[PDB]
Amino acid sequence: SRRARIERRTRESDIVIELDLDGTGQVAVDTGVPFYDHMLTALGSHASFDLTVRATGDVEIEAHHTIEDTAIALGTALGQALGDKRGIRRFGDAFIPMDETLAHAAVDLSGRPYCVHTGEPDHLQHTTIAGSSVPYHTVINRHVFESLAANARIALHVRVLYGRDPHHITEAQYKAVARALRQAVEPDPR
Amino acid sequence: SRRARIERRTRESDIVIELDLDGTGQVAVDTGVPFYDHMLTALGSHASFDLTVRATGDVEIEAHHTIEDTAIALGTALGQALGDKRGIRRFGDAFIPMDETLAHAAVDLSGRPYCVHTGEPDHLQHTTIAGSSVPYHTVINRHVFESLAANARIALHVRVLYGRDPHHITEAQYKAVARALRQAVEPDPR
Amino acid sequence: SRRARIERRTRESDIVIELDLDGTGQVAVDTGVPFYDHMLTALGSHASFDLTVRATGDVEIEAHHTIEDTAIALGTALGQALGDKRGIRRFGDAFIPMDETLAHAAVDLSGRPYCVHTGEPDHLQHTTIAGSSVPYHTVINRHVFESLAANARIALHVRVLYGRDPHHITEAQYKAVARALRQAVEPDPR
Amino acid sequence: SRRARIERRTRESDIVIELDLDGTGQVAVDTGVPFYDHMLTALGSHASFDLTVRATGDVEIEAHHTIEDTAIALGTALGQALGDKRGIRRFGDAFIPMDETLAHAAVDLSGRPYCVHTGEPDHLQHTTIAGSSVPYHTVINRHVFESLAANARIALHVRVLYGRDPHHITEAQYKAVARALRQAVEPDPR
Amino acid sequence: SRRARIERRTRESDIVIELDLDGTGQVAVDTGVPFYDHMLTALGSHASFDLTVRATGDVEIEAHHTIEDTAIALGTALGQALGDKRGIRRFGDAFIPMDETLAHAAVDLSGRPYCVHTGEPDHLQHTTIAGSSVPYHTVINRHVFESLAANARIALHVRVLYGRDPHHITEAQYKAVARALRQAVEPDPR
Amino acid sequence: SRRARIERRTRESDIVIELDLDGTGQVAVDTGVPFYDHMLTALGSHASFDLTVRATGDVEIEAHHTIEDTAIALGTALGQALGDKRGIRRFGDAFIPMDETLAHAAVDLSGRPYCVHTGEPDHLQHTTIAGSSVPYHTVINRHVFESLAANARIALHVRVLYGRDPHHITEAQYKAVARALRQAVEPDPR
Ligand SMILES: [Mn+2]
Ligand SMILES: [Mn+2]
Ligand SMILES: [Mn+2]
Ligand SMILES: [Mn+2]
Ligand SMILES: [Mn+2]
Ligand SMILES: [Mn+2]
Ligand SMILES: [Mn+2]
Ligand SMILES: [Mn+2]
Ligand SMILES: [Mn+2]
Ligand SMILES: [Mn+2]
Ligand SMILES: [Mn+2]
Ligand SMILES: [Mn+2]
């Protein structure tokens, strides 16, 4: 009923998205950026979407292009699946406590495209989350949310009330958006 | 079931309110103050009330008396429609993102009359919203919420987390109260 | 289905807790600390638990030991009643307006044990609430929440946005936790 | 071997102390000030003394006189039991973590009488610990340590590194002194 | 006598711990995070434990999950090996000088779960220790200590008095905890 | 078993040191600088060393050269007596209360040469301790500790937590080092 398939081929990347708004958390993400995969898995899961993401990009340069192209594609998919946006709750919000971190997200699905990202500690402008593969620079967090809000054409406010650990700060934000989205897309019985 | 009709004749104004708490957003507002009409329409709509407001007042002087008398009348109507307040959720809250603005409202319907209004930028103390008719002075926003809370006999906290545009700041607040009220008046299945 | 009985005998105190998560607000609390009884009644009631607390302790010394032992016991009971935590909403939050005070609580029931307590005015570090019996020192508020979060093994963030009266500040917090818990333990239809 | 019995009759109070330095924590304290009893129990226990304190005083006025007279008597007993102070470790110290509080104590048993008390938060100058009986004013903490150090004729430095709860701050200090004393009085194998 | 074996399978990781409190420093650690291995080796060695750690996790994402799961598992093992905690010294502390760095740790093994981590320079919130494999982000230091304290159910205060080098600051802390633990678990001859 | 004899002839001075780590406090010091003799006596005594120091130097110029040469020689002797440093506790620390002063010392005997000297009041940079003979300038305190740490090849941190009297500040430091050393050199039963 509320599905969307988006293919997006740029010079930097090639993306395929499959999105079902009324899913059960069946999520499979592979972008070549493992921490981004982890975040998009959290997104899909906590939003109760069925989400398949397959992305290959110029990760030798860095993750930026891949992360950004995926977010654009994902936003487009979200907007398409929403459709005319009839009979939905439209507004959604969520607080996410994650150990010492507390994040919050609020959405208006019919509201004009906008993104406000506030509260994130300053050290996230130059923090890296690194494993055995392509690393993740937390400075991209802003971009990811902006890109999604811009391409889904929704109002999205994301706040970090407080927090220390960059893994927790980042993950809390993704989960906050997921749960705000979940509430907003749900059918309204009025 | 939960209806109320209030007639209020003062020297300054004459007001009629018709309110159904369990409505479908059938709203008709005419106070002679067009921007106030726009706000009360947003209120009724987003609260899912059926609301009819008819008000005539000394708008040649200014909107103050009309806006205040309507708010008193509306609060009285809300309180009457609520009745004994049995088996309702009682507590409600809502975040409303409106472009750059984010507003929040929280209510306790059984709690003693109280109103706290915080966060509104200082320039709203001397901002006017003006069209082709009677203008609206944003300084009245406080009064409107206080008057309603006082006459409905409810606890009402309204916060502007941030914002710039006075139309957005004002509209977000009215919508926030509407959606907080909607949640609070809903029947509780416990 | 989701019940728990905890008996806890220390040198300082002897505690019995009976907890049903899926109750109707049938609450009976007797700790020998009347204001604590009032708070635990608010907790049980607003969480829609069925809660029986019976506690005797060394109240001649002060309430601390009794209040702390009860909170540990209560946390243990909450954790046990939750069980495997299958098919619940997991996340919950609540704003509680109480006259001039506004408090907020947010929980993650599956999240690792953690407690953050912020915003409480400084005078609550040396405020006493006193009647005709054992008094209550508001400095214990922190401890109570920490103890519960530690023994239920949950993430619990409690904030006072603003407030003046210590009775209101304390009561709002207890009610906020109750309603956050209520939302989190509720079955999720997904 | 290292025992002492002190009887001290003033106008304000009547005190009996029985002290064995080489005990097993057999402690019985009754001063008419329940929280002081709790602290002196912690002292005796954690020092591994055998300690019997019996005190009656003008508690209708307040605890001050009783608390001070006991501390003087106890210091005298400690000094007498120590004797010539031959073949002991002489120096002792202890850190005591108590939830959020961390306290420290350091002693020189042969060093000239001296007491330094630092780090205690300012609100302890006007904090009361109150149960169902005679209350305890944390401002006396200083006095108790000074009185003991003066009458045992020892160097005693007590520091609160950090802490919030007055019960914890007070109890940590008493336990810190106990364990510093324990180490100092122990026989030195050199 | 005081042994424990813990197996912990999560989605992120799989952990096996073998712990003997009364060991001779026979330590074998393999988590896939070499610097963490180095730290856990220092822990086991300086505590005079016999410790075997085997952990595999999603290190492609980053070390966080593995480091955290190991710490939880290790804390659980420590608590189990401690048992009823009868006839032990209970309190322990240690200063560790490491070149320019000085760190300190203090424990109460019977005290309620708590962790305070103070003094660490600000640049450790965004410092990485990197070799030829999975890197280590010093921001996790806090988490590791908190996780252990939470799962062993002990009071643990860790302080950096001063220091510059992040390798030294981190290593000193791990060694400080090890030696505080060693002293606390030792049998008390009273 | 753990002895050392060091002879050191410079242009400025001629030094003989005899050191037994496992002594009974048999100490005889003569450097021509009486206050230094007093300090080195405190060192040897409180460390439970057997120590003989005989030094003659250009004291007509000032004590500096003699004090420094002795400290170098003494450090060399300490290092030699320690030997391979097998089966010792290695780490040691001590707080020393001396009237109003509190000093602290912490050592790592196997740790790389290092000395940190902190907390000493500023007036000790230009304070003199003078009797009927060669005076002592407290500014040398730093040098003495640095010289020892450098020539014994040990980590040595010395702190003055607080203090006023320069005799007490100086003496407390020497005693603190002595007792830290005593604990570190002691055989470890593991
Ligand atoms: Mn970009
Ligand atoms: Mn007015
Ligand atoms: Mn508008
Ligand atoms: Mn206590
Ligand atoms: Mn406590
Ligand atoms: Mn009340
Ligand atoms: Mn006095
Ligand atoms: Mn994660
Ligand atoms: Mn974590
Ligand atoms: Mn190393
Ligand atoms: Mn020199
Ligand atoms: Mn002297």
Is the pair D, B in contact (3+ CB pairs within 8 Å)? no
User: How many Cβ pairs within 8 Å bridge chains A and C?
Assistant: 37
Q: What phi and psi values does residue A62 have, to the nearest 5 degrees?
A: -175, -175
Considering only CB atoms, which chain A residues are within 8 Å of B25?
190
E182: closest chain F residue by CA: F190
Q: How far apart are CA D116 and CA B185, in angstroms?
A: 62
Q: Which two tokens stand for residue A47?
A: 């939003």
Is the pair A, F in contact (3+ CB pairs within 8 Å)? no
Question: DSSP labels for B40-87?
Answer: HHHHHHHHT-EEEEEEEE-TTT-SHHHHHHHHHHHHHHHHHHHTT-TT
Q: How far apart are CA E182 and CA F12, in angstroms?
A: 48
C2 membership: H or E segment, kind and range: none
Closest of E156, E112, E155, D167 to residue C72, by C-alpha: E112
Question: DSSP labels for B137-151?
Answer: ETTHHHHHHHHHHHH
Q: Which two tokens stand for residue B60?
A: 């040649």
Considering only CB atoms, which chain E residues are within 8 Å of A32?
none
Ordered by start, the domain boundaries in chain E are 1-89, 90-190
The CA-based angle B163-B166-B167, given to 5 degrees, is 110
**F160 and F116 Cβ atoms separated by less than 8 Å:** no
The amino acid present at D96, given as its one-letter code, is I
E103: closest chain F residue by CA: F106
How far is CA D31 from each of CA A28, D14, D145, D167, rounded to the nearest angstrom?
70, 10, 17, 18
Q: How far apart are CA E181 and CA E173, in angstroms?
A: 12
Q: Cα–chain-centroid distance for residue E68?
A: 11
Collapsing DSSP to helix, strand or coil, B5 comes out as strand
A46 is in an annotated binding site: yes
Q: How far apart are CA F22 and CA F128, in angstroms?
A: 34
Numbered residues of the known binding site of F: 12, 38-46, 64-68, 90, 112, 143, 167-175
Q: How far apart are CA A46 and CA A38, in angstroms?
A: 12
What is the architecture, at CATH level 2, of domain C1-89? 2-Layer Sandwich (3.30)
Name the CATH superfamily for E90-190: Imidazole glycerol phosphate dehydratase; domain 1 (3.30.230.40)
A121: closest chain E residue by CA: E125
**C60 and D132 Cβ atoms separated by less than 8 Å:** yes
Collapsing DSSP to helix, strand or coil, B185 comes out as helix
Query: Using what technique was this structure determined?
Result: cryo-EM
**C132 CA to centre of ligand 5 in angstroms:** 24
Q: Does C125 contact D164 at a Cβ distance shorter than 8 Å?
A: yes
**E186 CA to centre of ligand 10 in angstroms:** 27
Nearest to B97 among A108, A118, A190 (CB): A108
**B112 and C97 Cβ atoms separated by less than 8 Å:** no
β-pairing, D3-9 vs F3-9, is: unpaired
Nearest ligand (C-alpha, residue F168) = 12
| Residues 6+ positions from B131 with CB-CB distance below 8 Å | B34, B35
D33: closest chain C residue by CA: C61
Q: What phi and psi values does residue E88 have, to the nearest 5 degrees?
A: -105, 165
Nearest ligand (C-alpha, residue C169) = 6
Chain C: give the shortest CA distance to residue A48, in Å: 8
Answer left, alpha or beta for residue B90, where phi above 0 means left and psi between -120 and 50 means alpha: left
Whose tokens are 């606390």? That residue is: E184
Q: Does C106 contact A95 at a Cβ distance shorter than 8 Å?
A: yes
Q: Which two tokens stand for residue B37?
A: 């009409």
Mutate to test the interface with D, among C10, C35, C61, C145 (most CBs of D within 10 A): C61
How far is CA D57 from each of CA D30, D39, D68, rounded to the nearest angstrom?
11, 18, 11
User: How many Cβ pairs within 8 Å bridge chains A and B?
Assistant: 37
The CA-based angle E89-E90-E95, given to 5 degrees, is 90
**Sign of the dihedral through C-alpha A57, A63, A68, A73:** positive
Closest of F81, F103, F82 to residue F4, by C-alpha: F81
Resolution in A: 3.1
Considering only CB atoms, which chain B residues are within 8 Å of C102?
106, 116, 157
Chain B: give the shortest CA distance to residue C80, in Å: 23
Nearest to A111 among B24, B98, B162 (CB): B98
B188: closest chain C residue by CA: C48
**C138 and C129 Cβ atoms separated by less than 8 Å:** yes
Whose tokens are 């989605």? That residue is: E11
Residues in chain F: 190
The amino acid present at C80, given as its one-letter code, is Q
**Same fold flag, F1-89 and F90-190:** yes
How far is CA D18 from each of CA D6, D23, D26, rounded to the nearest angstrom?
7, 11, 11
**A89 and A11 Cβ atoms separated by less than 8 Å:** no
Q: Does E130 contact A130 at a Cβ distance shorter than 8 Å?
A: yes
**E158 and E144 Cβ atoms separated by less than 8 Å:** no
User: How many Cβ pairs within 8 Å bridge chains D and F?
Assistant: 37
| Residues 6+ positions from B54 with CB-CB distance below 8 Å | B15, B16, B30
Q: Which two tokens stand for residue F157?
A: 């941190």
Q: How far apart are CA B32 and CA C93, in angstroms?
A: 41
Question: DSSP labels for A161-173?
Answer: EE---HHHHHHHH
β-pairing, E155-162 vs E114-118, is: parallel
Q: Does D24 contact E107 at a Cβ distance shorter than 8 Å?
A: no
Numbered residues of the known binding site of D: 12, 38-46, 64-68, 90, 112, 143, 167-175
β-pairing, C27-30 vs C50-57, is: parallel
**E146 and E187 Cβ atoms separated by less than 8 Å:** no
Q: How far apart are CA C5 and CA B56, in angstroms?
A: 64
| Residues 6+ positions from F167 with CB-CB distance below 8 Å | F129
Q: How far apart are CA E161 and CA E169, in angstroms?
A: 10
Nearest ligand (C-alpha, residue F143) = 11
Whose tokens are 């005796």? That residue is: D44
**Sign of the dihedral through C-alpha A46, A52, A55, A59:** positive
**C39 CA to centre of ligand 6 in angstroms:** 8
**E21 CA to centre of ligand 6 in angstroms:** 50
Under DSSP, the state recorded for E187 is: B
A170 is in an annotated binding site: yes
CA dihedral A145, A150, A154, A158 (to 10 degrees): 20
| Residues 6+ positions from B168 with CB-CB distance below 8 Å | B98, B99, B100, B101
Q: Which two tokens stand for residue E68?
A: 């955290």
**F56 CA to centre of ligand 4 in angstroms:** 60
**C164 CA to centre of ligand 5 in angstroms:** 25
Whose tokens are 């906008």? That residue is: A114
Considering only CB atoms, which chain C residues are within 8 Å of B157?
95, 97, 102
Nearest to E97 among F106, F118, F190 (CB): F106
Q: Which two tokens stand for residue D74?
A: 């106890």
D37: closest chain C residue by CA: C61
Breaks (C-N over 2.5 A) in chain E follow: none
Q: Does D156 contact F97 at a Cβ distance shorter than 8 Å?
A: yes
Nearest to B91 among C48, C100, C179 (CB): C179
Closest of F65, F173, F157, F143 to residue F111, by C-alpha: F157
Q: Cα–chain-centroid distance for residue F176?
A: 10
Closest of E158, E142, E150 to residue E74, by C-alpha: E150
Q: Does A98 contact C155 at a Cβ distance shorter than 8 Å?
A: yes
Largest distance between two CA atoms of chain F? 51
**A184 and A91 Cβ atoms separated by less than 8 Å:** yes
| Residues 6+ positions from A84 with CB-CB distance below 8 Å | none
